[PDB]
Amino acid sequence: DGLWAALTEAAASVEKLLATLPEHGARSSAERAEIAAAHDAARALRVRFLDTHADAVYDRLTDHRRVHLRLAELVEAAATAFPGLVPTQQQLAVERSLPQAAKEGHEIDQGIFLRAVLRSPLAGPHLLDAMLRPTPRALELLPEFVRTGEVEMEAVHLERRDGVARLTMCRDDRLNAEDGQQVDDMETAVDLALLDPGVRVGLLRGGVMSHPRYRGKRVFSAGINLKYLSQGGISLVDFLMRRELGYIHKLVRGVLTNDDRPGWWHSPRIEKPWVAAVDGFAIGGGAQLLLVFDRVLASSDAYFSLPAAKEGIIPGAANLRLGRFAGPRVSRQVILEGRRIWAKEPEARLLVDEVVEPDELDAAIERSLTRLDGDAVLANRRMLNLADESPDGFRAYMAEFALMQALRLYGHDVIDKVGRF
Amino acid sequence: TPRALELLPEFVRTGEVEMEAVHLERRDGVARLTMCRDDRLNAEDGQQVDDMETAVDLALLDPGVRVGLLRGGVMSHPRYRGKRVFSAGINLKYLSQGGISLVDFLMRRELGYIHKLVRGVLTNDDRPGWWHSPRIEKPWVAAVDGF
Ligand SMILES: CC(C)(COP(=O)(O)OP(=O)(O)OC[C@H]1O[C@@H](n2cnc3c(N)ncnc32)[C@H](O)[C@@H]1OP(=O)(O)O)[C@@H](O)C(=O)NCCC(=O)NCCNC(=O)Cc1cc(O)cc(O)c1
Ligand SMILES: CC(C)(COP(=O)(O)OP(=O)(O)OC[C@H]1O[C@@H](n2cnc3c(N)ncnc32)[C@H](O)[C@@H]1OP(=O)(O)O)[C@@H](O)C(=O)NCCC(=O)NCCNC(=O)Cc1cc(O)cc(O)c1
């Protein structure tokens, strides 16, 4: 064995190499190659080590799959129990304080870690269920929401009404560009909607924009905040992975609660149907969202796209779900070639259920909400999602994604492009 | 139009004519008419009709022009700044104001430049082939930005 011993050395070899070497972006060609080869040797051992001990490394962190740990708590606990395997909060604070172009790419190690974990028929499912449990922040807010029916947050406005959980993305100044805080609010909101007995159906829509170019008009989503990403503010674990295993997965499978109510023996997770209403446009992570709703409406002037065909990161789980909606040809036209799909063209019905003139939209959205109220919709929706996406499929995809994305999150072509927005 | 006759020699020489509602420019054999009321999304009015007809007349009378193109230009209004907009129709404000003329606007555009887009301009018997083509017509291309 002695793989740990080896890794600890490869890591040390790197850790000390960075202390003597000059600051990133001031290094010479011979220097960049040395630190590069060092990281490479370190990372290769991380894979080799986990390929045979991932389960043991995980059993120790979760007391043999007896304690559920969300993504952040897992990697943090991994950092302290296995120095060198993944970056400490400290190592990561230094990284988060540098613009993307100058990071050492320590997150990649977390990518290596989560891939091995997720690949296990034992740990992966356990980690997924962990992410399906309600956020502690939502539990805190649950009593006040059940009473007020209102919760204002930084990126989302939640309001209960007529049995509908109305989530409104309200970053009026940046066309709802996504960031870490938006993911926390989205998950918090989704958790509240699913935990409130007063809520029967959920609705996600964008609110009025204040920016001069869209003043007075609604805009669903302009995707990830490219400025922050360039700035080094987009977290692999806390943003990219958290949204896929968190609130987006809960939109599909609901929230795993404790055995604390009747029927839990047949429904451990509380799920509910969701409606998405797209105003203006849905780009990137926003268009990504759509592949998970029970109902989708859009105003006649909107379009859908995953633009970074060139130099972008992987469009989340779209590579996993789009084929199902559009077939492999259109799927590759949208993601590999960047084809944008307008609401009024025939193929938009592969993604949207209903397209309406902006002055008929609100009415159509209301009518949509009231058609998904019953228990028949709940049963049917659960069986359909079960057939459309299996536990293994989602898991295997999210496994390779963890790493593949980690790598794209530090690709020179991506960093460069993002720096020009 | 008499106004086009006046401007014909200067257009044949410069290949450019700036007007209040339209910008005409000859290039690569193309008569490029640009509706440029950047502040009101090219809302139509009496002056725009005079310019449109004047422009169409010039395009059809210039031997240097083979094909015509009509397009809207960049808007300055905050809601469309930097983007092109073809036409938002008649100026509703003026119409309310009593500034839309039945004869000079509504009828003039239909029997004037719009009919010339279809049948060309009837000239005098002052050139060969006039016996088989009294009107000079040319093909037109329209490019619509925004709406
Ligand atoms: C939407 C637009 C076409 C609008 O054009 P316009 O009408 O020309 O408005 P603009 O003047 O450009 O922008 C209005 C306003 O919003 C801001 N804006 C617009 N888009 C953005 C983004 N993406 N981030 C931040 N701010 C933005 C823009 O900076 C303006 O403010 P100012 O810069 O101060 O002027 C434009 O903003 C644009 O091209 N944005 C690029 C959209 C984009 O490419 N997003 C990339 C998406 N890529 C992903 O989501 C990747 C991803 C996301 C995920 O969530 C998960 C995942 O796994 C992968
Ligand atoms: C185009 C619009 C939808 C744009 O919406 P927005 O993005 O909301 O821009 P807005 O803020 O409304 O307008 C931008 C700007 O352009 C101005 N604008 C827009 N449309 C017009 C019109 N039609 N006239 C004058 N000014 C206009 C508008 O007043 C704004 O400036 P401010 O008032 O100071 O704010 C809106 O402007 C609009 O609804 N215009 C109504 C368009 C219309 O109905 N035209 C009526 C057409 N009816 C005919 O052409 C009839 C006709 C014409 C003929 O030529 C011949 C004939 O026989 C018959």
UniProtKB/Swiss-Prot annotation, chain B:
Chain sites annotated for binding substrate: D38, E44, H77, P78, R79, Y80, A88, G89, I90, N91, L92, K93
Disulfide feature: none
Record annotation: effect of changing E44Q: Strong decrease of affinity and the catalytic efficiency compared to the wild-type
Similarity comment text for this entry: Belongs to the enoyl-CoA hydratase/isomerase family.
Function field: Involved in the biosynthesis of the nonproteinogenic amino acid monomer (S)-3,5-dihydroxyphenylglycine (Dpg) responsible of the production of vancomycin and teicoplanin antibiotics. Catalyzes the unusual conversion 3,5-dihydroxyphenylacetyl-CoA (DPA-CoA) to 3,5-dihydroxyphenylglyoxylate. DpgC performed a net four-electron oxidation of the benzylic carbon of DPA-CoA and the hydrolysis of the thioester bond to generate free CoA. DpgC has the ability to process a diverse range of substituted phenylacetyl-CoA substrates.
Subunit structure: Homohexamer; dimer of trimers.
Official protein name in the record: (3,5-dihydroxyphenyl)acetyl-CoA 1,2-dioxygenase
Residue range from the parent sequence: 146 to 292 of 438
